[PDB]
């Protein structure tokens, strides 16, 4: 393609680690220290590192528990899974550590508690002082692991392509429509299931096409909402086009894009678009975002936002 | 918006770390070990951790030095900066360690343990931390832009492209997407080079253009040449002042999106000998660069 | 559904393991032995178990290397991956063990070599005497892990549904066709890519429809093969219908059925069908199986099997 | 057939084990440790491994006792047999261990290690061993049969079923698949029960039947009732003598395929309030069993 295009990161770090392991093993052999001390240091280092990761995961879970409904379907198992790996394993070594602590001969106890408290203090400093800060090489590695982090791209493409050019003149469009023939402000429907029908009527019988809007093609339709048959106001309704890409992404079947990733990114896209639109020059009192999940009547969902005006 | 929608991650981890700090300091006060030993061992532990991170970065330098020209503009300083997380904080911690000071035995032991951390993958990020990085901002746009292009314009153009090409000769058989890493694409391709001029079109409504390529005023080839639409988004973002999208960030996402689009098309069913990508960067004649791919047939 | 229908196996074994861990930890605490001996035994046991798994994986790789092209694309990395887990990790601990062995003070060496040889002998006995035999509960767990082991089902369904009822009267069909208007024996095309076109002609321009066959619907077509324009014999050609299911399985996009699993099971189905047909009463000299991979002209592939007759 | 097609796995592992045996015995002869100590420690190691496998099976008994009625016909003997791999070989090894004989300390230690083997998943099968089991024979047919039914008949019937139902009333709105675990399905449903009789059909060619259900000679409901096609395959296999497919194996795959088909339809897009599965087993009136699901609406 181009020599300036980065190739995907390989395993040079693993090769460097192999070389470093060989060099350190050779040096340790040369120094002539007993292998027992090497094994002891490795066991201690691994145990200390995993206890530090346990403390870091507990600290994160103290914050990740706040998104229990939003992120982990309200079940604690996945929240603990996503914060400190396998909870069954972690519990197994937790009980092993409790046994070790309660089985010391009391001539080693307070020293061991002192060491444990020092490790906890070091981990707390690491979290508070930010010494566990990812280098941007590692950040880039995470953000390039797979081609699924589409939420930011979809949100920004949507904004620039459509909303940056629709909203500025939309108010004038609605004004001329009202003068010639209410319907205030654009409404973007955000189904987290990302099910976008061709037209809105089959999605909800209380939403029926009324008319188009004057003035590329920029085909925006005016929809009227019926509450118990009575038309309880009308509004310009519109599905989020980029949510069609996520739906088609999962049906692609060669991307490996699952339904769970479909919902995770629709949720991320839902938040990102609001953040972009919060400070956008041409979105103040000019559009509304309606996010809903199928378990519910769409008409009432849209109607609730018209009352606030 | 909707309760299921996650809110951005807060500072609860910092509060938990503060609680842990309070508990640990209360404990240390309870035991009665003298403060100086506690402080000395704390600085020793922090110094060991920082030198271990230095070794981890040096190991990562092996991988990051292979992208010296592609990713870091042929500058070693940039590569080392990208390998070490916080140069200032690590510098301060190493300065404290130096102030507070066999010996080669523990250097090898600490290196051996760090080597096994990389090899056995013990520093792998948890899903909570993987996703936290992925939503740090709103500038990881390359993946979404590439999938939007494929699932949108490209998937519904490639399989019918060979057909419309087949009715024109009675012109290359591939769709040629130009990808300038500067993301500067004009309305048409005449301003790009004087050697490319509009010829005709190809029968929702899809508007594809034929552009004949010539050398020294003489025809030398013709193909369906079209800019990549989602580069408008990358360029328009940079001009959008309130985003904070810089040229370096724009140029980074332009490259990743270029590579991402290639992997999508590598395994795609509709891109078999149908699509060709031309990634180019002005230090240059566009016509010659495209013509190189035309002669590749 | 039905109380006689087994539910998917849960994690009762994990709960029993937790209870056993708790009981053994309590007993160890009661006995009052030093925790150091417990930690030493655990480290020794884990190291011994992983060395035993390394030896078992090496023994398997001594046989898995024989299927390098067929199974692992001719690359050793995946073969070593599929036999003994991560080879980088295994190499890391292999070098660590070499360092430990070469760093003993020569007053422990021969004892350690004796222990290592005993472990190797025990592993060799385990493999040879079959003491590492999976209980049928575990076999059922593996065979029920996911709904992808479709090869045996597809092969048997194909046999019973189609071939058991087509082959017995096919020879009579070809005989009456020849008498009324060569073409001997059924030919089943087996594309490992499982790309089944609606008709054969677009797959290969040298295969063109000639006629159907007399005598449910049982629509079998007679195809003529052209070599350099000259018709080099004709034969009853037919795609393997169950390979359409695998192709549609991967395009389903909600099953998680990847292209690699598509090829793995098509390969397994290819072998299973031959095994069924080897001893089938009505398949002796009555059908041929043609397996091919897209990198190749289909006509020559089919023609090669007509020469042998 | 084709070189890429894997051949069935041979006995190369046994040859490698023989080579390892030769090397290890040559080593033991070289060192000069007396034979009796070697043999005694070998039997001790084998006894420890066998008792560890016994503990692993006892732990697996917790999971296998929950399927006592479903999987093992309500017999404890069957469950214990299914948890322990080779009762005879383990019995012989434990007999040798008993012949060759603190003490409770090592029992807890050996149990603790076995507990962590299960909890940390250190006995997980490698991909080579996972696939070796999956191709031990050719009787793991439940997965393929279920996917063939869905991707074939079912996927192209369910979405147009509600339509053809909607044109008939001017009848239940679901397709009812009967799944007798004996795999015995007649040509039509009249022989099944006298309370089910053919009524009419529903407009490649698909032949769906309407079957009215009645009680005491009185109409009580009507629905599209049809047997599961791939149960013919399971039953026909058993009658096929050269396969070796027994009733117990047929009944095992019938159940797994029944459950497998439910998971496919649980996440399917075309089975939303469209398909209902009726798994039944004669120790019984079929009409009453189906009618229970009819009233569930
Ligand atoms: O097994 C393995 C495991 O482990 C893993 O996981 P992770 O997350 O990575 O974890 C980690 C561990 C460690 O590391 C490793 O791995 C190895 C090394 C060694 C170490 C030593 C000891 C330590 C201390 C403790 C005491 C007991 O972590 C930890 O630490 C724990 C341990 C346990 C586990 C393992 C065992 C071994 C031992 C040896 C001795 C020397 C993953 O999972 C991987 O994969 C593996 O698995 P598999 O399946 O592959 O086999
Ligand atoms: O593998 C894992 O995930 C894992 C998770 C958690 C732990 C873990 N270790 C301890 C120890 O006190 C301990 C042990 Cl027992 C042996 C050697 C050295 C040490 C101490 C230096 C830190 N400890 C105390 C409370 C809570 N947790 C743990 C170890 C793991 O290996
Ligand atoms: O984790 C893994 O995959 C893994 C893989 C391989 C090994 C591994 N251990 C040894 C040892 O001699 C050893 C060590 Cl060094 C410390 C304590 C006890 C022992 C011996 C009782 C067996 N050994 C010798 C040759 C080849 N391999 C290994 C250990 C792992 O943990």
Q: Phi and psi dihedrals of B192, rounded to 5? A: -60, -60
Q: B142-160 burial, b if ≥16 CB within 10 A, otherwise e? A: bbbbbbbbbbbbbbebbee
What is the number of the ligand 1 atom nearest to the C-alpha of C85?
Answer: 50
**DSSP per-residue codes, D47-105:** HHHHHHHHHHHHHHHHHHTTTHHHHHTT-HHHHHHHHSS-HHHHHHHHHHHHHT---HH
The verdict on D5 touching A (C-beta cutoff 8 Å) is: no
The verdict on C21 touching B (C-beta cutoff 8 Å) is: no
What's the CA gap between B114 and A41, in Å, rounded?
12
Q: After which residues is chain A broken (C to N over 2.5 A)?
A: 181, 215, 295
**Residue nearest atom 26 in ligand 3 by C-alpha distance:** C94
Residues of chain B in contact with residue A118, where contact means CB-CB under 8 angstroms, are 24, 28, 38, 41-42, 45
Could you tell me which residues come within 8 angstroms of residue C130 by beta carbon, excluding any fewer than 6 positions away?
A: D86, D89
**Residue nearest atom 48 in ligand 1 by C-alpha distance:** D122
Q: What angle do CA A254, A255, A260 make, to 5 degrees?
A: 120
What's the CA gap between C49 and C54, in Å, rounded?
9
The experimental technique used to determine this model is cryo-EM
What's the CA gap between A220 and A200, in Å, rounded?
12
Structural domains of chain B in order of their starting residue, each with its CATH number: 12-134 (no CATH), 142-295 (3.40.50.12100)
* B122 C-beta closer than 6 A to ligand 1: yes
* A44 C-beta closer than 6 A to ligand 2: yes
Q: Give pairs for C40-49: CB < 8 Å, separation 24+.
A: C41/D109, C41/D113, C42/A96, C42/D112, C42/D113, C42/D116, C43/A39, C43/A43, C45/D113, C46/D113, C46/D122, C48/C119, C49/D117, C49/D122
Nearest residue on chain C to D253, alpha-carbon basis: C153
What's the CA gap between A23 and A17, in Å, rounded?
10
Using a 6 Å CB cutoff, which residues line ligand 3? C 43-44, 47-48, 50-51, 54, 89-90, 93-94, 96-97, 100, 119
What's the CA gap between A219 and B205, in Å, rounded?
14
Under 8 Å between Cβ of D294 and D213:
yes
What's the CA gap between C10 and C7, in Å, rounded?
8
What's the CA gap between D46 and D33, in Å, rounded?
19
Phi-psi sector, C256: left (phi>0), alpha (psi -120 to 50), beta: left
CA distance A180 to chain C (A): 49
**Residue nearest atom 24 in ligand 3 by C-alpha distance:** C97
Question: Could you say which ligand is closest to the alpha carbon of residue A58?
Answer: 2
Under 8 Å between Cβ of D45 and D104:
no
Resolution value in angstroms: 2.7
Of residues A18, A62, A161, nearest to B119 (C-beta): A18
Question: Could you say which ligand is closest to the alpha carbon of residue A43?
Answer: 1
What's the CA gap between A269 and B5, in Å, rounded?
10
* Token representation of residue A275: 């953040």
| Helix (H) or strand (E) segment spanning residue B24 | helix B12-31
Q: Do chains B and D touch (3 or more CB pairs under 8 A)?
A: no
Residue A227 Cα to chain centre, angstroms? 36
The verdict on C5 touching B (C-beta cutoff 8 Å) is: no
Distance A53 CA to ligand 3 centre (A): 25
Under 8 Å between Cβ of A250 and A257:
yes
Could you tell me which residues come within 8 angstroms of residue D174 by beta carbon, excluding any fewer than 6 positions away?
A: D223, D224, D273, D274, D275, D276
Residues of chain B in contact with residue A33, where contact means CB-CB under 8 angstroms, are 102, 105
Q: D47-71 burial, b if ≥16 CB within 10 A, otherwise e? A: bbbbbbbebbbbbbbbbbbbbeebb
Question: Could you say which ligand is closest to the alpha carbon of residue A42?
Answer: 1
Residues of chain A in contact with residue B102, where contact means CB-CB under 8 angstroms, are 31, 33
CA distance A156 to chain B (A): 7
**β-sheet bridge partners, residue D36:** none
What are the angstrom distances between the C-alpha of D252 and each of A210, C1, C144, D131, D246? 58, 15, 12, 20, 10
CB atoms inside a 10 Å sphere around CB A206? 21
Q: Do C144 and D256 touch (CB under 8 A)?
A: yes
The answer to whether D79 is a known ligand-binding residue is: no
The verdict on B116 touching C (C-beta cutoff 8 Å) is: yes
Of residues A3, A150, A160, nearest to B144 (C-beta): A150
Closest CA relative to residue A213, chosen from A241, A244, A172, A242: A172
Distance C43 CA to ligand 3 centre (A): 10
Q: Give pairs for A252-258: CB < 8 Å, separation 24+.
A: A252/B151, A252/C253, A253/C250, A253/C251, A253/C252, A253/C253, A253/C257, A254/B267, A254/B268, A254/B269, A254/C250, A254/C259, A255/A147, A255/A148, A255/B147, A255/B264, A256/C256, A256/C258, A257/A148, A257/C253, A258/C256
What is the number of the ligand 2 atom nearest to the C-alpha of A115?
Answer: 21
DSSP-derived letter for residue D125 is: P
Closest CA relative to residue A119, chosen from A47, A40, A37: A47
* Token representation of residue D242: 């050269």
What's the CA gap between C236 and C184, in Å, rounded?
7
Alpha helices in chain A (DSSP H): 12-31, 35-64, 68-72, 76-84, 87-102, 109-129, 136-143, 151-158, 164-180, 242-251, 259-278, 298-308
CA torsion sign for C77, C80, C85, C86 is negative
Q: A161-191 burial, b if ≥16 CB within 10 A, otherwise e? A: bbbbebbeebeebbeebeeeeebbbbbbbbb
The verdict on A278 touching B (C-beta cutoff 8 Å) is: no
Nearest residue on chain C to D18, alpha-carbon basis: C124
CA distance C174 to chain B (A): 39
Q: After which residues is chain D broken (C to N over 2.5 A)?
A: 101, 170, 203, 283
What's the CA gap between D245 and B262, in Å, rounded?
49
The verdict on D120 touching A (C-beta cutoff 8 Å) is: yes
The answer to whether D227 is a known ligand-binding residue is: no
* C46 C-beta closer than 6 A to ligand 1: yes
Instruction: Name the one residue in this structure whose structure tokens are 């048409």.
Output: B188
Closest CA relative to residue D190, chosen from D225, D164, D220, D157: D225
Under 8 Å between Cβ of A208 and A224:
yes
Instruction: Name the one residue in this structure whose structure tokens are 């990508």.
Output: B277
The verdict on C89 touching B (C-beta cutoff 8 Å) is: yes
The verdict on A89 touching D (C-beta cutoff 8 Å) is: yes
The verdict on B119 touching C (C-beta cutoff 8 Å) is: yes
CA distance A88 to chain D (A): 7
Residues of chain B in contact with residue A242, where contact means CB-CB under 8 angstroms, are 144, 148
SS3 labels along chain C: CCCCCCCCCCCHHHHHHHHHHHHHHHHHHHHCCCHHHHHHHHHHHHHHHHHHHHHHHHHHHHHHHHHHHHHHCCCHHHHHHHHHCCHHHHHHHHHHHHHHHHCCCCCCHHHHHHHHHHHHHHHHHHHHHCCCCCCHHHHHHHHCCCCCCCHHHHHHHHHHHHHHHHHHHHHHHHHHHHHHCCCCCEEEEEECCCCCCCCCHHHCCCEEEEEECCCCCCCCEEEEEEECCEEEEEEEEEECCHHHHHHHHHHCCCCCCCHHHHHHHHHHHHHHHHHHHHCCCCCCCCEEEEEECCCCCHHHHHHHHHHHC
* B120 C-beta closer than 6 A to ligand 1: yes
**DSSP per-residue codes, B125-145:** PPHHHHHHHHTSSS---HHHH
Instruction: Name the one residue in this structure whose structure tokens are 């010829």.
Output: B199
Range list of β-strands (E), chain D: 175-180, 196-202, 208-215, 218-227, 275-280
Q: Which of C36, C43, C46, C51 to mutate to test the pocket of ligand 1 (most atoms within 8 A of CB)?
A: C46
Under 8 Å between Cβ of C160 and D60:
no
Phi-psi sector, A41: left (phi>0), alpha (psi -120 to 50), beta: alpha
Nearest residue on chain A to C99, alpha-carbon basis: A25
Q: What angle do CA D227, D228, D232 make, to 5 degrees?
A: 100
Under 8 Å between Cβ of C203 and C194:
no
Phi-psi sector, D139: left (phi>0), alpha (psi -120 to 50), beta: alpha
DSSP-derived letter for residue D172 is: -
Could you tell me which residues come within 8 angstroms of residue D173 by beta carbon, excluding any fewer than 6 positions away?
A: D162, D165, D273, D274
Q: What angle do CA B175, B176, B181 make, to 5 degrees?
A: 145
Q: Phi and psi dihedrals of A205, rounded to 5? A: -70, -15
Question: Could you say which ligand is closest to the alpha carbon of residue A95?
Answer: 2
* C42 C-beta closer than 6 A to ligand 1: yes
Residues of chain A in contact with residue C259, where contact means CB-CB under 8 angstroms, are 254
| Helix (H) or strand (E) segment spanning residue A256 | none
The verdict on A121 touching B (C-beta cutoff 8 Å) is: yes
Range list of β-strands (E), chain B: 175-180, 196-202, 208-215, 218-227, 275-280
Q: Phi and psi dihedrals of A87, rounded to 5? A: -75, -25
């Amino acid at each position: 393609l181009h020599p300036s295009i980065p190739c995907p990161r390989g395993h040079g770090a693993q090769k460097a680690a192999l070389v470093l392991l060989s060099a350190c093993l050779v040096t340790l052999w040369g120094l002539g220290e007993p292998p027992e001390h090497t094994l002891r240091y490795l066991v201690l280092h691994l145990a200390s590192l995993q206890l530090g990761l346990l403390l870091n995961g507990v600290c994160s879970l103290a914050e990740e528990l706040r998104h229990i409904h939003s992120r982990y379907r309200g079940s604690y198992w996945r929240t603990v899974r996503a914060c400190l790996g396998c909870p069954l394993r972690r519990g197994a070594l937790l009980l092993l550590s409790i046994y070790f602590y309660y089985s010391l001969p009391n001539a080693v106890g307070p020293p061991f508690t002192w060491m444990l408290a020092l490790l906890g203090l070091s981990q707390a400093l690491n979290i508070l002082l930010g010494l566990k800060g990812l280098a941007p090489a590692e950040i880039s590695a995470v953000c390039e692991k797979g081609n699924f982090n589409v939420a930011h791209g979809l949100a920004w493409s949507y904004y620039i392509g459509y909303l940056r050019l629709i909203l500025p003149e939309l108010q004038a469009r609605i004004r001329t429509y009202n003068q010639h023939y209410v319907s205030q402000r654009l409404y973007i429907l955000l189904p987290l299931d990302c099910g976008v029908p061709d037209n809105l009527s089959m999605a909800d019988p209380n939403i029926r096409f009324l008319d188009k809007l004057p003035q590329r093609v920029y085909s925006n339709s005016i929809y009227e909402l019926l509450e118990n048959g009575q038309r309880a106001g009308t509004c310009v309704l519109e599905y989020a086009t980029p949510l069609q890409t996520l739906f088609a992404m999962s049906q692609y079947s060669q991307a490996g894009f699952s339904r769970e990733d479909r919902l995770e990114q629709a949720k991320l896209f839902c938040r990102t678009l609001e953040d972009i639109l919060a400070d956008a020059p041409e979105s103040q009192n000019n559009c509304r975002l309606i996010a809903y999940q199928e378990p519910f009547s769409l008409s009432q969902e849209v109607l609730r936002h018209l009352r606030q005006e």
